[PDB]
A paper describes a structure:
We prepared the crystals of the [name]-ceftazidime complex by soaking a crystal of the [name] free-form in mother liquor containing 100 mM ceftazidime for 4 h. Crystal structure of the [name]-ceftazidime complex showed an acyl-enzyme intermediate where the S64 catalytic residue is covalently bound to the C8 atom of ceftazidime, and its β-lactam structure is cleaved. In contrast to the free form, crystal structure of the [name]-ceftazidime complex revealed a drastic structural change of the R2 loop in that the H-10 helix was disrupted and disordered at residues N285–L293. In comparing the crystal structures of the [name] free form and its complex, the C4 carboxyl group on the dihydrothiazine ring of ceftazidime occupied the position of the side chain of Y346 observed in the free form. The side chain of Y346 in the complex in turn was rotated 108° toward the H-10 helix and positioned to clash with the S287 residue, and this appeared to cause the disruption of the H-10 helix structure. We did not observe overall structural changes except for the R2 loop with the RMSD value of 0.68 Å, and the positions of the substituted residues E114, K120, and S211 were almost identical. The residues I284–L293 almost correspond to the disordered residues in the crystal structure of the [name]-ceftazidime complex, suggesting that, in the crystal, the fragile structure was entirely disrupted by the complex formation, without the influence of crystal packing. Our structural studies presented here clearly demonstrate that the ceftazidime molecule is bound to [name], and that this in turn leads to the drastic structural change of [name] to accommodate the ceftazidime binding. The structural change of the R2 loop in [name] leads to further expansion of the substrate binding site for cephalosporins, and this expansion is a major cause for the reduced susceptibility to cefiderocol of the strain. In the [name]-ceftazidime complex, the K120 residue formed a stable salt bridge with the D123 residue.
Residue numbers in the entry: 2 to 284, 291 to 361
């Protein structure tokens, strides 16, 4: 059983050389141990203006934004507004291209739609460009054949998922997920009064923030603090005291297993592997692989490693938890650094907290 000092000594002994080796300017880390968050901060949120990382510092979550997407989508399922078996064209009729018949919300939500591009092109800047973009996309595989990770599929899923509620994605995410969970420092658009807490990302030694883009809120655009992300991991790990019945089940649905791709199972936003597992088995994510459908989706199991990585131009994020142990970690950095380094550091910390 670890004391808070033993936790701090473990986390520092991993993060301190990591930040020097990767030249990370600032990091915020939360460990969930026995269900309780422990907070750690090092370095600068802004090097030139000498602003330290605090527990309020806002980091670009990058693709960890897709976990908020999944939970809001699972919430919509629980409300009865959508079903994953529903066709895409139900919620966007102007998608009359014959290639869209047979594509369901399930596919956009789990990257199995047949091969949408990784990013929405920079050319696309309004509804017309975006509708034209999807209308003229030619699939590479039949729906459900392969998993190909992308922003453009789960990004569209989140925008369509919220149409029954009659609410925008930002508004729905705020009303149905952020506010009920008390995530008061998690933003799609950082308010004026919070700009000063918005850390700068660093790429090649220069400060950068990500630029807006079509479907950015749904795929990569959430900013948040280490305290909120600790609460976000807490709630996804154990929603047993979430009061909203639909949000509680949405969290459960997001950790259901919808597809098997080797040793990994695709949730809604979240990804899972069986626990316990070797570090090397987490350490080709950008490759298209055959997807085996799990139908019905298998309910969540405690003995899993639930995680999501995210990156922007100037930030690297990683969150991971193992529900069987009430154990989890949030890793926020204002520099993008290699994915296997995050996994290895997360594993090293959580392996000593057994
Ligand atoms: C390789 C991908 C595919 S896109 C996806 C996504 C979510 O984090 N990232 C972006 O959309 C993104 N950059 O991705 C990389 C890291 C590939 C990049 O091009 O920098 C981005 C969004 S706004 C911004 N600035 N950058 N994640 C990753 C990852 O594994 O880090």
């Amino acid at each position: 059983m670890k004391t808070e000092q033993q936790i701090a000594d473990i986390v520092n002994r991993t993060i301190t050389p990591l930040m020097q080796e990767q030249a990370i300017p600032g990091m915020a880390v939360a460990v969930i141990y026995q269900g309780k968050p422990y907070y750690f901060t090092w370095g600068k949120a802004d090097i030139a203006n000498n602003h330290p990382v605090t527990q309020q510092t806002l980091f670009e979550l990058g693709s960890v934004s897709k976990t908020f997407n999944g939970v809001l989508g699972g919430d919509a399922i629980a409300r009865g507004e959508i079903k994953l078996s529903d066709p895409v064209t139900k919620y966007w009729p102007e998608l009359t291209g014959k290639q869209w018949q047979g594509i369901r919300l399930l596919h956009l939500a789990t990257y199995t739609e047949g091969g949408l591009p990784l990013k929405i092109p920079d050319d696309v800047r309004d509804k017309a460009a975006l509708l034209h973009f999807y209308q003229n996309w030619q699939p590479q595989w039949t729906p459900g054949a392969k998993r190909l990770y992308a922003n453009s599929s789960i990004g569209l899923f989140g925008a369509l998922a919220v149409k029954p509620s009659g609410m925008s994605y930002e508004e729905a995410m705020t009303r149905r997920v952020l506010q009920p969970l008390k995530l008061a420092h998690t933003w799609i658009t950082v308010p004026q009064n919070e700009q000063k807490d918005y850390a700068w990302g660093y790429r090649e030694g220069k400060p950068v923030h990500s630029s807006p883009g079509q479907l950015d809120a749904e795929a990569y655009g959430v900013k948040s603090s280490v305290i909120d992300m600790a609460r976000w991991v807490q709630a996804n790990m154990d929603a047993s005291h979430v009061q909203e019945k639909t949000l509680q089940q949405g969290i459960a649905l997001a950790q259901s297993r919808y597809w098997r791709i080797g040793d990994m199972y695709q949730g809604l936003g979240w990804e899972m592997l069986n626990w316990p597992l070797k570090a090397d088995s987490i350490i080709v994510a950008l490759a298209a692989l055959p997807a085996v459908e799990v139908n019905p989706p298998a309910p969540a199991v405690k003995a899993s490693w639930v995680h999501k990585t995210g990156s922007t131009g100037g930030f690297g994020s990683y969150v991971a938890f193992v529900p069987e142990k009430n154990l989890g970690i949030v890793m926020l950095a204002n520099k993008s650094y290699p994915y296997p380094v995050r996994v290895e550091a997360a594993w090293r910390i959580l392996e000593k907290l057994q």
